[PDB]
Amino acid sequence: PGSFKERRPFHERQKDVEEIRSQQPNKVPVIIERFDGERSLPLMDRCKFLVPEHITVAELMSIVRRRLQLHPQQAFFLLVNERSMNSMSMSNLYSQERDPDGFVYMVYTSQ
């Protein structure tokens, strides 16, 4: 529904990751989009982020909060592929949940 996977075919997605891996082998390719079942939080201008291996989910949350210009005590959560997410570093998240295209996919929800 205009998601990254729908707008970008597979071979193109694989090509984005191989670009990232060879230019910046240290960085985790993350896709962040609005949950299909979320309607209150707004959409975001970009969905593609390349983040240091060592940063945490809580840090990833600040990144979204800031980009969406949310209230600091606005309650929201990230799902991976679609389960609950925090202290997980990007390195660990990626080892457990990366997509076959080589991105790891997240969505934010307020519920």
Side-chain angles (χ1 to χ4, degrees), residues 1-110:
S3 72
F4 184 76
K5 282 192 172 187
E6 302 306 325
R7 309 176 295 103
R8 275 295 251 198
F10 185 87
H11 85 91
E12 228 109 347
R13 283 181 271 126
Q14 213 162 193
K15 278 195 257 283
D16 295 353
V17 169
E18 82 175 13
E19 182 176 21
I20 288 147
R21 295 288 306 275
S22 73
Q23 294 187 310
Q24 305 176 88
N26 42 327
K27 308 249 183 156
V28 175
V30 179
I31 297 301
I32 308 170
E33 306 173 288
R34 192 170 72 172
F35 186 39
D36 278 321
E38 171 69 24
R39 287 290 143 87
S40 316
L41 296 185
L43 291 159
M44 191 152 64
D45 43 337
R46 191 35 178 168
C47 67
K48 193 167 90 183
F49 303 87
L50 328 176
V51 288
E53 183 259 54
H54 59 89
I55 78 152
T56 67
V57 160
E59 171 60 21
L60 202 57
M61 308 216 49
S62 307
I63 301 180
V64 172
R65 186 178 301 273
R66 165 162 50 247
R67 183 134 223 174
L68 278 180
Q69 302 127 3
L70 304 176
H71 194 293
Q73 301 192 48
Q74 177 122 31
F76 79 104
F77 318 89
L78 299 182
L79 312 176
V80 203
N81 298 316
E82 243 143 274
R83 30 217 175 249
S84 17
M85 225 350 191
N86 203 38
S87 51
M88 174 132 40
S89 62
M90 297 296 108
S91 61
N92 183 33
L93 168 60
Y94 191 76
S95 79
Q96 299 189 42
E97 295 287 4
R98 54 169 292 234
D99 192 87
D101 65 14
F103 282 108
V104 55
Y105 288 86
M106 322 279 290
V107 298
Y108 51 86
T109 176
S110 43

